[PDB]
Amino acid sequence: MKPGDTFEVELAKTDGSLGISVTGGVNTSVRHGGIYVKAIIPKGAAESDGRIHKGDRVLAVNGVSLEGATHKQAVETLRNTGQVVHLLLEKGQVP
Amino acid sequence: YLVTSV
């Protein structure tokens, strides 16, 4: 419960699903790059980290920035990965 | 589209 907090979570997606439904994206008026969670799966890999809620910001994945990434590109950036998804997540809680 | 489980 602090601002400026980042969690680098490493997950292995279970049959093509970490467990987050993506929203936001550069196409929306976000911080010029970032995908965000709209919905958490109850007990996929993502929720099994669980420091996420339905508010947080994905800034980078596998060390790969969501720079210029929109809905489709953000999926591609999470989905077409080398199994391990190191999610660089920022707080969905404002200062 | 939005909201894609991945």
Place of tokens 């404002």: A94
Chain B contacts in chain A segment 42-81 (CB below 8 A):
71-72, 75, 78-79
- Number of Cα atoms under 13 Å in the Cβ half of residue B6: 26
Domains of chain A: 1-95 (2.30.42.10)
Q: Name the nearest CA neighbour of A45 among A19, A80, A75.
A: A19
Residues 6+ apart with CB under 8 A from A58: A22, A34, A35, A36, A37, A66, A74, A78, A87, A88, A89, A90
CA distance B4 to A84: 18
Q: B6–A71: do the CB atoms touch at under 8 Å?
A: no
3-state secondary structure of A50: coil
Q: A71–B5: do the CB atoms touch at under 8 Å?
A: no
Q: B2–A38: do the CB atoms touch at under 8 Å?
A: yes
Q: A18–B6: do the CB atoms touch at under 8 Å?
A: yes
Q: Are A77 and A58 in contact (CB under 8 A)?
A: no
Nearest to B3 among A18, A38, A72 (CB): A38
3-state secondary structure of A73: helix
